[PDB]
């Protein structure tokens, strides 16, 4: 289900998309896929919205079985983009579209890549071919008010605020990860290992964590503990009936103990209009890998492109 806001029913294809400053306001926008609509408008000359009637909870995932999507509060890359935690970059030509997802008819798809996050949009009136590589005309998208059907998120991914690590420990992890995957030559066009000869690229479903340096750390064997840190980001605030609280209202709730809430929120922030509650999510994920513990920015199991030693 949704985090705060029930799915959007839009009318004005041409309605502006406001920059809302409250955190719960931004989560509300994320619930209604307004961030992805914003993305399409900005990058691929698209009028209107995606997410009609379904919102974020009806988005399409590759793989279709999504563990992290059953947790309404786990942040997808796109969600993280809207919260300024990372950038889902507009695809360049050299960005690789992985095979396997049912791209046909999609209007937007994103995937974690080895060195970032890439998103692919189609203009107004167009959608993707099966290969994902071309935007061709589609009369079913004429409405400009398109169902969540048309949004594709690749990967079992959770993003979250990160405890930045020094370059030293990133280099150690990058090296550890190189020795775990000695036969990988490049991932998503990035040199992973030095290779003399190299296979044709092929899909690669790999576990990875983003620890905020030049590229991700793909992992063979790792352990994950989820910890509920009950920080302010873990709570959303809403007025009864009328959706999310104001930026100002949310702030005083989370800093002054003057609003109503559920039992965890009252414990950490205080309680005596707005109500704040725990978002449904397992917590922040801590990764043990390379004999290190680390709080990554994103964590996931996603498809990328790899070549192998020949």
């Amino acid at each position, epitope marked *: 289900g949704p985090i705060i806001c029930a799915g959007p029913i839009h009318s004005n294809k041409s309605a502006d998309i406001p920059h809302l400053l409250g955190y719960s306001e931004k989560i509300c926008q994320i619930d209604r896929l307004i961030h992805v609509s914003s993305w399409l408008r900005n990058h691929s000359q698209f009028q209107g919205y995606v997410g009609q009637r379904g919102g974020r909870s009806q988005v399409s995932y590759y793989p279709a079985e999504n563990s992290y999507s059953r947790w309404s509060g786990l942040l997808s890359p796109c969600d993280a983009d809207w919260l300024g935690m990372l950038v889902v970059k507009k695809a360049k*030509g050299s960005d*690789m579209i992985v*095979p*396997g997802p049912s791209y046909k008819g999609k209007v937007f798809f994103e995937r974690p890549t080895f060195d970032g996050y890439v998103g692919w949009g189609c203009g107004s009136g*167009k959608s993707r*071919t*099966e*290969s994902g*590589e*071309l935007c*061709s*005309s589609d009369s079913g998208t004429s409405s400009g008010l398109l169902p969540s059907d048309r949004v594709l998120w690749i990967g079992d991914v959770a993003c979250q605020p990160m405890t930045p690590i020094p370059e030293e420990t990133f280099l150690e992890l990058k090296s550890f990860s190189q020795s775990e995957f000695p036969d990988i030559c490049k991932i998503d*066009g990035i040199v992973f290992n030095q290779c003399e000869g190299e296979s*044709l*690229p092929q899909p690669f479903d790999v576990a990875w964590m983003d620890v905020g340096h030049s590229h991700k750390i793909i992992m063979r064997e790792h352990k994950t503990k989820w910890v509920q840190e009950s920080s302010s980001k873990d709570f959303v605030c809403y007025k009864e009936g009328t959706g999310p609280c104001s930026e100002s209202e949310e702030k005083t709730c989370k800093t002054s103990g003057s609003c109503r809430g559920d039992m965890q929120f009252c414990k950490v922030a205080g309680c005596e209009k707005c109500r704040c509650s725990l978002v449904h999510k397992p917590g922040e994920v801590v990764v043990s890998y390379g004999g290190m513990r680390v709080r990554p920015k994103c964590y996931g199991f996603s498809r990328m*492109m790899a070549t192998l030693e020949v």
Partner: nanobody
Amino acid sequence: AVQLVESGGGLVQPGGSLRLSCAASGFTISNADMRWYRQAPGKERELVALLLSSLGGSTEYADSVKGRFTMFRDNARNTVYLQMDNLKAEDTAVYYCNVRWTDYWGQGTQVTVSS
């Protein structure tokens, strides 16, 4: 080493036809996914047609060229083709042949359409 050699570009009057070939070395196109790009001067590299082994051999075309260009392969000959019919001035470009997800590009062949 992978090699891609293109052929078949040239001068053609509007309405004319050309067949572009891409002979490949160092992989078998019967498993590869192949793409045809074109690059006009000033404009950006635009993807024009695909043959996707990942899709069982299916074929996909950009909207501008749909219905005039035809991509196909000769597995025996390890060669992929782009048949271009009813050529327009806007088809003038250098055409490139590329292996999907790789920096394997053909030399490029020049297609010029003019009356």
